[PDB]
Design a binder for this molecule. Structure first.
Ligand SMILES: Nc1nc2c(ncn2[C@@H]2O[C@H](COP(=O)(O)OP(=O)(O)OP(O)(O)=S)[C@@H](O)[C@H]2O)c(=O)[nH]1
Ligand SMILES: C=C[C@@]1(C)CC(=O)[C@]2(O)[C@@]3(C)[C@@H](O)CCC(C)(C)[C@@H]3[C@H](O)[C@H](OC(C)=O)[C@@]2(C)O1
Ligand SMILES: [Ca+2]
Ligand SMILES: [Cl-]
Ligand SMILES: [Mg+2]
Lengths: 329, 189, 189
């Protein structure tokens, strides 16, 4: 028994991360190559923050005017091709990240394209700088890299086989998806549930979640996917929790229907989770369920999951639910 | 169910032959629409006769363009030896119906070997056809060919087992697709 | 095979398909692409079953180019010309629909001509129906030198379209092999 699974979703949704978790969980020089990529993540993350400070409205100010010189150092090196990563970089990088103004700009990151792994790596510069550095499993999970094309990852669980297919979520890339529509066990559709306050990259205008919603309706209602069921991976629940509890950007100020929404009776909140988060996480779910409910006609079904792709302690648990559901197909 | 059934099957070790007429346009001006079409049909009938003996399955007649892979419907060991001898026949075939027409014209033959998909598309007016980059190459080989000569690739030589007197073709000089994809081309004697 | 007087011939290519076609392993070495072409060509073959297009006769697909004609079921006067146009606007609707479900942006490039043809079977082994004559050559050349989303017609074909309520715009001059320079027009919406 083999099962061909297609992973779908917008850009930076989780797709790649999840393939990674399958390798952590159900598979086995190899990591020295990935170190460079993490450093790039760190570079692209710090520049992006400072570069954005002066272009925001209102513009942001450094708490320490001394730092202006590092700000100058970073922008000077921003374009450099095969960047050398001298120990100055890390020094200046760290210093900036200590500056409360640089951070205050980072709070307003919903207003410019900033990778998810920023705050993670910017909190651990001193570890990455060492020449004897070797990335932790969570470091490899967090390393963001764009997927161009389609990548087949084969693994097995209990002699049962799985072929997993990774695709680009970016608009230009979606044109390749079709190639995996025939002979497919089930769709795993990934959503960055936390991205409710930020616009997409491709046009810098269209809201990320709304893009995700429209992309789901496209897939759910596709002409070549009326048989095929979709496992819905509402993902980035940690980041979602953060925002709701942080209270900086309200959801109803982006999705006004939220004000006219009370929490479901069938809700099963995780032990001692905040009623506010509860309300929020299930509302994003129901938004997706309306699409799946509307059409379908018992030929395919929607199975939601609350997911944290960077938490293997939640991937195993939910991937287990998916092994279960795969019983009939 | 959800996709239409595709009537297409994958096939490796096959050899694709495109054949075009050199100076067809000059002929097209010298005789009436009647005569041209009659001379055309009279030629491709001969071509089809030669095709079946040389074990090549004819695919389509496109205006003045003829193509017929060998190695179909079921594999053949001499799948490239066929086409060469098949192409050989077309140069003679055309010559007979060349000087009898008045104006001199010639066949320009290009050949490649590789994998193809084949079968039929759509629902209506089915015609058996072939597709692959190897077919795309095949067609460009004909484009970048020489009159009365047979253009062959490095692949359609790794199948010829050194039976024909070859020589450098310089396909990069006649066709951009060949040059830009860096293809070593040859000609026969 | 018999000749004709006023037959309206049309080519419709998808030039942006050649780029889309890749040969990997995930896509079964180019099959998964054909699977799409099929879905499209079949949607294009499906239109002929409409009553308004009962006079449309698909001749062949060339690569990924749809070729159809009107007025072959002959013995207003140029009603069929304006039906061929009506037909090409339809293919654009099928393509637009595919695009939605295929996350793609395929555009269609149409050339349309009318004039005398010759119609009939060709080839000894598998007799297949095709239509020759300069009319088609020109039709072919007005596809290949066309523009995306636009229909490209000859002058007198534009003349007819105006006498049927269609507005037009001049492209300028095209060089057709063997027929020289000649003035072409796009149809407007
Ligand atoms: N905090 C947090 N970060 C996450 C979570 N899931 C994914 N990320 C991070 O978000 C980033 C984007 O996801 P990633 O897998 O890299 O791209 P993608 O979704 O596959 O999209 P693409 O590569 O096709 S363009 C990754 O760097 C990953 O570490 C999550 O649940 N919580
Ligand atoms: C269908 C996909 C693809 C890429 C594959 C292929 O081999 C072709 O079908 C051939 C080469 C091939 O089918 C042989 C005939 C012909 C007419 C020469 C084709 C066209 O050049 C196609 O290009 C067009 C115009 O679609 C092309 C190249 O398209
Ligand atoms: Ca020619
Ligand atoms: Cl997303
Ligand atoms: Mg990815």
């Amino acid at each position: 028994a083999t099962h061909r699974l297609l992973l779908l979703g917008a850009g930076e949704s989780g797709k790649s991360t999840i393939v990674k978790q399958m390798r952590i969980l159900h598979v086995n020089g190899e990591k020295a190559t990935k170190v460079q990529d993490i450093k790039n993540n760190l570079k692209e993350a710090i520049e992006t923050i400072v570069a954005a400070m002066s272009n925001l409205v209102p513009p942001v100010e450094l708490a320490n005017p001394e730092n202006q010189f590092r700000v100058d150092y970073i922008l000077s090196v921003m374009n450099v091709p095969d960047f050398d990563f001298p120990p100055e970089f890390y020094e200046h990088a760290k210093a900036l990240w200590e500056d409360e103004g640089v951070r205050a700009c980072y709070e307003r990151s919903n207003e410019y394209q900033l990778i998810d792994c920023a705050q993670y790596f910017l909190d651990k510069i001193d570890v990455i700088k060492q020449d004897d550095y070797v990335p932790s499993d969570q470091d490899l999970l967090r390393c963001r890299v764009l997927t161009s094309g389609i990548f087949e990852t084969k693994f097995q669980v209990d002699k049962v086989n799985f072929h997993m297919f990774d695709v680009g979520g970016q608009r230009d890339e979606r044109r390749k998806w079709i190639q995996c529509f025939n002979d497919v066990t089930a769709i795993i559709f990934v959503v960055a549930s936390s991205s409710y306050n930020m616009v997409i990259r491709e046009d810098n205008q269209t809201n990320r979640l709304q893009e995700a919603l429209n992309l789901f309706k496209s897939i759910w209602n596709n002409r070549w996917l009326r048989t095929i069921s979709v496992i819905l991976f509402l993902n980035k629940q940690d980041l979602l929790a953060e925002k709701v509890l942080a209270g900086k950007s309200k959801i109803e100020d982006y999705f006004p229907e939220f004000a006219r929404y009370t929490t479901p009776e069938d809700a099963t909140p995780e032990p001692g989770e905040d009623p506010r988060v509860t309300r929020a996480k299930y509302f994003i779910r129901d938004e997706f369920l309306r699409i799946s409910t509307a059409s379908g006609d018992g030929r395919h079904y929607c199975y939601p999951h609350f997911t944290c792709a960077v938490d293997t302690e939640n991937i195993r648990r939910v991937f287990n639910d998916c092994r279960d559901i795969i019983q009939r197909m | 169910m959800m996709f239409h059934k595709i009537y297409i099957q994958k096939h490796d070790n096959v050899s694709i032959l495109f054949a075009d007429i050199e100076g067809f346009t000059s002929l097209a001006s010298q005789c009436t629409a009647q005569e041209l079409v009659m001379t055309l049909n009279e030629l491709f009938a001969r071509f089809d006769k030669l095709a079946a003996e040389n074990h090549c399955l004819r695919i389509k007649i496109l205006g003045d363009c003829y193509y017929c892979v060998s190695g179909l419907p079921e594999a053949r060991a001499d799948h490239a030896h066929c086409c060469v001898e098949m192409g050989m026949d077309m140069i003679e075939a055309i010559s007979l119906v060349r000087e009898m027409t008045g104006v001199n014209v010639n066949m320009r033959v290009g050949i490649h070997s590789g994998r193809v998909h084949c079968g039929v598309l759509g629902l209506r007016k089915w015609q058996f056809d072939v597709w692959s980059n190897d077919v795309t190459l095949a067609n460009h080989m004909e484009a970048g060919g020489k009159a009365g000569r047979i253009h062959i690739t490095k692949a359609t030589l790794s199948y010829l087992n050194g039976d024909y007197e070859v020589e450098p073709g310089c396909g990069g000089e006649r066709n951009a697709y060949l040059k830009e994809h860096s293809i070593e081309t040859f000609l026969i004697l | 095979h018999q000749s004709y007087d006023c037959v309206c011939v049309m080519f419709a290519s998808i030039p942006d398909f050649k780029e889309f076609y890749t040969e990997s392993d995930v896509n079964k070495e180019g099959l998964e692409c054909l699977r799409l072409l099929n879905e499209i060509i079949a949607d294009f073959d499906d239109l002929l079953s409409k009553p308004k297009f009962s006079g449309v006769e698909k001749i062949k697909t060339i690569g990924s180019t749809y070729m159809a004609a009107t007025g072959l079921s002959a013995i207003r006067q140029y009603m069929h010309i304006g039906t061929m146009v009506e037909f090409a606007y339809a293919l654009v609707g099928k393509l637009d629909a595919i695009n939605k479900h295929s996350f793609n942006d395929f555009k269609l490039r149409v050339g349309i001509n009318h004039g005398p043809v010759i119609a009939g079977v060709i080839g000894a082994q598998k007799p297949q129906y095709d239509i020759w004559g300069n009319t088609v050559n020109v039709a072919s050349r007005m596809d290949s030198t066309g523009v995306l989303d636009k229909i490209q017609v000859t002058e007198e074909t534009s003349l007819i379209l105006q006498t049927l309520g269609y507005t037009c715009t001049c492209r300028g001059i095209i060089n057709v092999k063997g027929k020289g320079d000649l003035k072409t027009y796009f149809v407007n919406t």
